Design a protein. Sequence first.
Length: 309
Amino acid sequence: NKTVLCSNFFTSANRVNCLVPVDGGRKLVYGTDSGIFISERWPKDKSAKPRRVLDASQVTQIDTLEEYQLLLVLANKTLSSYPMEALELAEGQNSVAKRPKKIQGHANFFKAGIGLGRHLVCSVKTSALSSTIKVYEPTLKPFKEYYIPAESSSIHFLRSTLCVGCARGFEVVSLETTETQSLLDQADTSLDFVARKENVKPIHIERMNGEFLLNYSDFSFFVNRNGWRARPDWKISWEGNPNAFALSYPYILAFEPNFIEIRHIETSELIHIMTGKNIRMLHSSTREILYAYEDEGGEDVVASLDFWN
C-alpha cells in the first residue's frame, strides 16, 4: 500500500528536500529551501497544516540523535545541532532553544550512527578530486579525521569501521588505527563486471544474515564479508540510475528521479515499476518508506509505502 500523507501544503514554490520522523514516528520534521516545519503523523484535525519551527535556508539533510535529544541540520553547507525542545509548541521565535550550535562550517553530507566506542556523527566534504571525513562524539566534540583521494557518494557504519562509497568502490576505513582497504576481493573473478566499469556510484549497504547486499547505481549483488561473491548466479542490473535504496522483505526498492523499481530479493525478478517526476526517497524505517514526488501543477506530494502479508 501507498498512502498520500500531504499533497496540499508544499508546492513548486518550496519543495520538500528532506525529512526525519521524531517522537517515535508520531511527528514528521521537513527541511526545505526556506525553513523547517513540523506536523503530526496522525493528526486529529485534518485542517491542520505543518507549522514553521526554524528559519534556515537551503536545508538539504536532516536527522536526529534521539538519545541526546539533538536535531542535526545541514543548511547551505553548514552542519549544526539544535536541542529537540526547539520543536516544542511552547517555544517562541527568539527563545534560546532555537539557537544553532555550529558543528562544521562547510559540508556536503553527513551520517549519524552507532559506531563504537561512544556513538557518532560524520561530516564529509567531497569534490571530483577528494573527500575529507570528520567524526564527532557526544554537546558535540570532534574526535578523528580522515582523508580519501576520490569523490564520495555515501557513508556507512560497519562495526568498528567506516565504509565509504567513493568512485573506485566501497573502501573500508579503520576508526582507531589505519588507513584503508577495498571491500571487494581482486581475485574473485565473478566480480569482474564491477571492475569493468570505472567509475561507479556505491549507494547503499545492507546486512542480511552473514551476507551483505551491495547496491550501486548500476547493479546490486550479494557478498560474504571478506567481500567474496555470494549467490554467484544472482544479479540485478537497474533500469535507471537510482540514487537511493530501501529493503522491505521480500522487496528491494530502487528510487531514481523518474521511477521507482521494485524487485523480489529471492528471485531477482521485476515486480512493479511506479513512474513519476522528481521522486526523492525521504526516509526508510521498520514502519514505512516515506518519499516525495511532483504532481500537476505544481503540487509537491509526500507519501508512504508500507508492506504487509
